[PDB]
Amino acid sequence: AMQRIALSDKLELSRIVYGMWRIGDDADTSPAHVQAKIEACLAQGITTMDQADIYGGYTAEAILGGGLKAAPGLRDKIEIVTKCGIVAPAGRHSSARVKHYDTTAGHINVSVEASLRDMGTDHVDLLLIHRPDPLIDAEETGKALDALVASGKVKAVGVSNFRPWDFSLLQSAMSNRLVTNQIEMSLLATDTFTNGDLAYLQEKRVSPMAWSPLGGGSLFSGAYGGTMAALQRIGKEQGVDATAVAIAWLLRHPAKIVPVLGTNNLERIRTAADALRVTMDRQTWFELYTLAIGKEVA
Amino acid sequence: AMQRIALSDKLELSRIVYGMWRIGDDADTSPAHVQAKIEACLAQGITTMDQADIYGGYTAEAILGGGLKAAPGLRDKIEIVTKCGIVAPAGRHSSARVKHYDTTAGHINVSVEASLRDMGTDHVDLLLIHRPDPLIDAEETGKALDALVASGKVKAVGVSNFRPWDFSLLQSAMSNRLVTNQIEMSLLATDTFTNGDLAYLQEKRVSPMAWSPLGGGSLFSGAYGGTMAALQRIGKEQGVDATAVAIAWLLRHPAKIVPVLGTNNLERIRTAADALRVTMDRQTWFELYTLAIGKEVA
Amino acid sequence: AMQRIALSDKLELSRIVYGMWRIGDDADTSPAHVQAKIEACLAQGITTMDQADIYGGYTAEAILGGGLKAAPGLRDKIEIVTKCGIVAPAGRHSSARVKHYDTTAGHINVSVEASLRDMGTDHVDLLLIHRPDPLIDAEETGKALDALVASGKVKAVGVSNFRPWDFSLLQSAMSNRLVTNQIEMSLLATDTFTNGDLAYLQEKRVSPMAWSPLGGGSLFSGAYGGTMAALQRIGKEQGVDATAVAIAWLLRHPAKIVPVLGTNNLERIRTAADALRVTMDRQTWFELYTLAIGKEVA
């Protein structure tokens, strides 16, 4: 939020990122309401907006563009993260017979062009390959990503949901450094803390971005009563809500996780940055971890 | 078949490899009938024959030998892949009490000597360690494999069913490059596409060989209705049977998979190269992948 | 362990190690009894004693201390392995709210001071981080472990229960080589032989230490009757007990496993080196492995 994180020389994000994956599903997709969402973020020092070609059935970037095209200079205040690689039978890909992945140079280039056109800008700050593609030609995808960096259309490149072997294979075909891996991380999604996925990034000194950093709402919806009670106690102790403590749990990790919080609620945007005020000591981090997992550490 | 693949400077195979593991299950195991199978393969440009010490209860190599010895000049037309490391209590290994692995210098050397005598040749083109041995002394095995290449008895060495860490360990003890990993891959066996086994080989630029490329029979059993519908549809569309589409699904992967097709059926040998006639686009590869894993891609 | 194993230029262990995890469970924790246990080990050339700060609720090192202080120069006859990183609410950490890990320089330094004071020595031979810590700051932990070696308080450093990726992350932050990884390995815990954990150490030429080589007793529980029957049959053939054959199974592996046997029974301590007299041929190793996995090898 106020804290800023250098993914590289050429890219600095806000430590908390605003996720736009539901921006299209709001009743109000007016340029004024989109500007309002972005301004509420910027008021908390949240400058990084997370997009993808696929969001809102390939319309979410165009809804954001409504905002930026209407408000000159708003784009220069934000970092835009987008993604490509999923072809789902929706919007401009509604003729697809099956959901599939496409990491071809041709598809990456047309997805970036559509991103630039829909959002009304000549560059994005970060492009991620959205999913690991079991049919990837790493030589073709890596050259495509390197060419987009060399063109200035993309400031930096990364991946999402990649396993270490997928990250290694694509990195082995590239001159540019992949600057992040956007992966699912929360109190409810802790497998990467122990299974090698996070250790791999830490050793590479790569910050992950965490999607569904609250566990997609499942924290609050009745299967994590113990974890909830602890989050509410700590929240009452430090004057913040359970949500702020759950995000602070991610921020405490030395891998320097960048949480992506994707919400249409202007109330929950306004408190988004409260996690930076939480103090999360080692013992409290293990308390929350062992409540969520339902077993003491070995 | 038509197409050839360089595993190294020293070894080139046919892109489709004839699997001889059932050679001893045929009612007829006569020299003439073996020459007939080989000649049926050579007619298609399928020059590579896949053997193992253990095939046919340690008799398959002797049956191939019947053919090669009766026709002196046939061997110069083919590449012979053989394997060792499994000791089953069968044939010349009747005295073993338990099925076990043996990767000792002495066992490898005696296995190769028997392959050379049984097939009536002074060399094999490719020797594989048949299974990863939980009791492997990598230094001893690696030294023995390097010596066999230096002697000219074996043109190149590879492994079979190795995990990446098994491959890494053995390669660390050897001067010669392991040229392949022969692993199960098919629309019924897709784990290597996502679990790091194939990414490892793709990053190292090692072509896998794929055994049971049709599920060793189970794909056509009618348990996989959705998958066979698409294979049969695509086959009808391109004038080939379902089995040629299922092999073409492997050939479409950019890791340059080398399928091994095992059959005694002269008609199925005559049509074995039809897989190379199939054109399969990315979307169709994912249609079949999707049908095979029984759910949408993430 | 007449046989000795160099883990480094500065550290040699006995091939069999006496684990003291149970030393606080004995009704008798008197100095004379502790000396009797050490003396029974030394009579057989077992010189290495395995400790941890946490054993006996943070009292086992003090119990060993009682024996060593009572017998000047006994400490110069042995190697002491200890560990830190686990904070359970017991003994001097009874103030802890929850079982957690602590790999901070502060905790490591205080734990090592408590080890040296309780055991009455100015150094330990080997210090292990006891468990992989999801909150590890590898830079901080690594500098702390290197500082301890440079001070002379620790001759060598290692880890315990680390996955290969945890081992790799910590090693990347250190100048000294981690000299071992103390992992569970037994005829009832065989996953590391196939899952990449042993292969990683074998490729790095790092001897693992094996803890619970008898499953902490579970091997004799009744759920492993087939394994036990074979162990007693082999034991009777060679004039040793089931324990000796189960440990000889670990000793047979080419990765030079160092088994850690924890018992308070003076007659079992007195035969602990019998494992080194067992002849364990490849077929017998695979007989016992086949019993461990419950099916023939693939």
Side-chain angles (χ1 to χ4, degrees), chain A residues 1-204 206-235 237-255 257-266 269 271-298, chain B residues 1 3-204 206-219 221-235 237-266 268-269 271-298, chain C residues 1-38 40-96 98-255 257-298:
Chain A
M2 251 32 256
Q3 204 220 306
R4 295 194 67 73
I5 173 157
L7 266 53
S8 75
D9 283 346
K10 309 141 210 194
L11 185 58
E12 186 179 90
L13 306 187
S14 51
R15 179 70 191 270
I16 302 191
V17 165
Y18 179 60
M20 282 178 176
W21 63 354
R22 296 166 172 187
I23 200 168
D25 312 348
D26 203 325
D28 191 357
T29 69
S30 68
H33 197 219
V34 163
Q35 284 155 23
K37 284 172 166 157
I38 302 179
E39 292 290 9
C41 286
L42 289 164
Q44 309 307 306
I46 299 162
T47 64
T48 306
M49 313 288 124
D50 175 87
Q51 274 282 185
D53 65 339
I54 188 159
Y55 291 163
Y58 304 89
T59 68
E61 280 181 329
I63 294 168
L64 168 62
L68 309 178
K69 274 160 208 164
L74 195 51
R75 189 269 175 276
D76 304 307
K77 297 213 292 237
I78 57 166
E79 305 85 25
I80 299 175
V81 180
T82 192
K83 318 186 190 75
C84 69
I86 308 179
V87 182
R92 62 169 191 266
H93 292 290
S94 55
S95 72
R97 301 200 314 281
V98 67
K99 186 182 178 187
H100 61 283
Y101 304 128
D102 190 333
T103 53
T104 62
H107 182 70
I108 292 164
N109 290 335
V110 306
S111 311
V112 168
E113 278 322 312
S115 291
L116 296 182
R117 180 172 42 63
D118 282 2
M119 289 184 282
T121 177
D122 64 344
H123 73 288
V124 297
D125 296 282
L126 177 62
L127 175 72
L128 308 184
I129 301 299
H130 203 161
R131 284 281 169 183
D133 173 9
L135 197 57
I136 193 169
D137 181 337
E139 292 293 316
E140 177 188 356
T141 305
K143 176 178 157 172
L145 293 175
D146 281 346
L148 280 162
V149 175
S151 81
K153 275 178 174 154
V154 175
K155 273 192 149 95
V157 290
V159 296
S160 185
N161 308 298
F162 273 40
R163 308 299 312 282
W165 45 89
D166 300 316
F167 192 110
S168 186
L169 172 63
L170 177 56
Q171 185 65 87
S172 79
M174 289 183 63
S175 57
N176 291 280
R177 297 283 100 196
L178 297 172
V179 306
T180 193
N181 190 9
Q182 182 172 307
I183 49 167
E184 187 190 358
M185 313 176 94
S186 71
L187 285 162
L188 275 46
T190 60
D191 293 346
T192 72
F193 291 91
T194 55
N195 76 0
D197 282 21
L198 186 54
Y200 178 78
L201 298 175
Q202 289 183 263
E203 183 167 341
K204 290 305 200 267
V206 162
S207 272
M209 294 175 86
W211 65 260
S212 294
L214 295 181
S218 289
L219 204 46
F220 302 107
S221 67
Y224 293 96
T227 307
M228 274 306 304
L231 290 166
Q232 280 159 351
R233 187 238 309 144
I234 296 147
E237 285 161 16
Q238 313 200 21
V240 295
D241 63 7
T243 290
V245 184
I247 300 307
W249 183 84
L250 285 176
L251 300 169
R252 176 52 180 80
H253 190 292
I257 300 163
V258 177
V260 179
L261 187 36
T263 179
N264 288 150
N265 209 118
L266 274 158
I269 300 172
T271 74
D274 286 343
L276 270 81
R277 267 206 310 283
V278 176
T279 291
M280 170 82 34
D281 65 12
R282 177 169 281 278
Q283 192 163 27
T284 299
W285 189 98
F286 276 91
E287 182 190 358
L288 289 175
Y289 179 65
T290 45
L291 283 169
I293 288 189
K295 200 181 176 62
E296 70 178 0
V297 301
Chain B
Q3 196 201 118
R4 293 199 68 83
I5 186 146
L7 295 189
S8 70
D9 286 10
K10 297 292 212 157
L11 182 62
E12 184 190 79
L13 306 188
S14 53
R15 188 59 196 276
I16 288 168
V17 167
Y18 183 59
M20 289 195 157
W21 74 273
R22 307 200 217 243
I23 198 79
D25 296 353
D26 194 314
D28 175 12
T29 61
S30 69
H33 195 208
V34 170
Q35 279 147 200
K37 289 168 165 167
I38 297 171
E39 276 171 315
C41 289
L42 295 171
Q44 309 284 104
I46 298 174
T47 60
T48 305
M49 315 286 123
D50 179 276
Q51 274 289 359
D53 60 346
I54 187 166
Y55 291 167
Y58 299 94
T59 66
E61 278 177 337
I63 293 164
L64 168 62
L68 300 182
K69 286 154 177 170
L74 201 41
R75 197 259 173 279
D76 190 39
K77 298 194 187 173
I78 60 172
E79 301 83 29
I80 295 163
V81 181
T82 188
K83 310 188 194 75
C84 64
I86 313 173
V87 185
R92 65 173 192 262
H93 287 125
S94 268
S95 306
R97 75 167 175 288
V98 69
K99 189 191 180 187
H100 65 274
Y101 301 133
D102 193 330
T103 54
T104 65
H107 180 72
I108 290 169
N109 292 340
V110 170
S111 293
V112 170
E113 281 315 309
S115 299
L116 291 192
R117 176 159 21 71
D118 285 355
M119 292 183 292
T121 185
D122 59 355
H123 70 283
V124 294
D125 296 275
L126 180 56
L127 178 66
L128 308 183
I129 303 300
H130 201 167
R131 288 275 176 186
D133 173 13
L135 200 58
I136 188 161
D137 178 338
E139 291 303 317
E140 175 184 3
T141 302
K143 193 174 182 207
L145 291 176
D146 279 341
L148 280 167
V149 174
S151 80
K153 286 164 194 278
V154 171
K155 291 329 183 213
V157 291
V159 297
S160 189
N161 304 301
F162 280 37
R163 307 305 311 279
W165 47 87
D166 302 316
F167 194 111
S168 183
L169 174 58
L170 183 51
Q171 183 63 82
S172 75
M174 290 172 64
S175 167
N176 283 281
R177 295 274 104 199
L178 298 172
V179 301
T180 194
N181 189 8
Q182 180 178 301
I183 56 180
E184 183 188 2
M185 319 176 74
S186 75
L187 282 162
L188 288 203
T190 60
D191 291 347
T192 69
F193 289 92
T194 56
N195 75 355
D197 283 23
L198 187 56
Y200 180 74
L201 298 171
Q202 187 172 354
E203 186 182 329
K204 296 299 189 212
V206 175
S207 267
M209 302 174 73
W211 63 258
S212 285
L214 309 175
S218 303
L219 184 48
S221 83
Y224 306 99
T227 303
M228 271 293 273
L231 286 176
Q232 284 175 310
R233 181 196 78 246
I234 294 151
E237 293 167 4
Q238 295 193 43
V240 297
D241 52 0
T243 78
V245 177
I247 293 165
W249 186 78
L250 291 175
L251 296 176
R252 183 47 180 84
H253 196 285
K256 287 185 211 316
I257 304 173
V258 172
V260 177
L261 182 51
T263 178
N264 290 129
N265 191 295
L266 253 11
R268 281 173 36 100
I269 298 173
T271 188
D274 283 358
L276 284 148
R277 288 179 38 210
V278 172
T279 302
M280 194 180 293
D281 65 14
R282 170 167 281 276
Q283 183 161 204
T284 302
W285 189 93
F286 275 95
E287 184 185 356
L288 284 174
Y289 179 60
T290 289
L291 287 164
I293 67 175
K295 63 184 144 153
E296 290 197 312
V297 297
Chain C
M2 214 158 291
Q3 194 221 310
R4 301 190 63 78
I5 198 92
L7 296 192
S8 79
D9 287 348
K10 292 86 196 291
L11 181 59
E12 198 178 79
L13 304 189
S14 54
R15 185 57 193 285
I16 297 170
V17 169
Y18 180 59
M20 290 187 164
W21 71 271
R22 301 178 182 283
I23 203 167
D25 300 328
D26 200 315
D28 179 3
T29 64
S30 74
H33 196 218
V34 171
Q35 284 178 58
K37 290 169 182 176
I38 298 166
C41 291
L42 289 172
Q44 290 174 95
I46 302 170
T47 62
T48 301
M49 309 290 125
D50 176 272
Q51 272 290 359
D53 67 342
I54 183 166
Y55 293 161
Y58 300 96
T59 69
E61 284 172 321
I63 293 168
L64 168 57
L68 293 180
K69 291 155 141 91
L74 189 53
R75 194 272 173 268
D76 300 308
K77 291 182 182 187
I78 62 168
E79 301 84 30
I80 300 173
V81 183
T82 192
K83 315 186 188 80
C84 64
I86 315 178
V87 184
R92 59 176 193 264
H93 294 294
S94 57
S95 33
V98 66
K99 184 176 181 187
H100 65 282
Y101 299 131
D102 192 332
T103 53
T104 60
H107 179 74
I108 287 165
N109 289 344
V110 169
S111 298
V112 167
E113 286 309 302
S115 287
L116 300 180
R117 173 173 60 76
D118 287 356
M119 287 187 284
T121 184
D122 59 356
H123 72 281
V124 293
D125 298 276
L126 177 58
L127 174 71
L128 310 181
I129 302 296
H130 199 165
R131 284 278 172 186
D133 171 21
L135 278 187
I136 188 160
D137 184 329
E139 293 285 87
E140 183 196 347
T141 298
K143 281 181 218 185
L145 291 173
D146 283 335
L148 284 170
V149 177
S151 83
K153 286 166 185 287
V154 171
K155 289 205 176 188
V157 289
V159 297
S160 189
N161 304 304
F162 275 38
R163 306 308 303 281
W165 46 88
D166 302 316
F167 192 110
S168 187
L169 177 55
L170 179 56
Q171 181 66 88
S172 71
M174 290 175 57
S175 48
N176 292 280
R177 203 180 41 90
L178 294 171
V179 306
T180 192
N181 192 8
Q182 183 174 300
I183 55 170
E184 178 172 12
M185 312 177 80
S186 78
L187 278 167
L188 111 193
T190 60
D191 286 356
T192 61
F193 289 87
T194 57
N195 73 1
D197 288 6
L198 186 52
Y200 176 83
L201 298 174
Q202 184 172 356
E203 182 171 332
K204 296 300 184 223
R205 299 197 199 193
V206 172
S207 268
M209 294 178 83
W211 66 259
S212 294
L214 311 177
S218 308
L219 195 58
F220 317 118
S221 69
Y224 301 91
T227 303
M228 277 309 310
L231 291 177
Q232 290 171 326
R233 183 199 85 249
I234 298 152
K236 199 168 141 90
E237 295 160 355
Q238 303 199 34
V240 299
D241 72 352
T243 290
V245 183
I247 290 168
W249 187 81
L250 294 169
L251 290 181
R252 176 60 174 79
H253 195 279
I257 305 166
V258 177
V260 175
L261 178 60
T263 180
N264 284 315
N265 179 313
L266 279 166
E267 292 314 297
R268 297 182 75 199
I269 295 150
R270 280 167 191 146
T271 57
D274 279 15
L276 285 170
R277 273 159 33 227
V278 177
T279 59
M280 170 70 57
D281 71 13
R282 178 169 276 278
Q283 270 203 101
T284 305
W285 192 90
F286 272 96
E287 171 183 9
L288 292 169
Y289 180 69
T290 297
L291 289 169
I293 69 170
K295 51 178 169 168
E296 277 185 333
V297 300

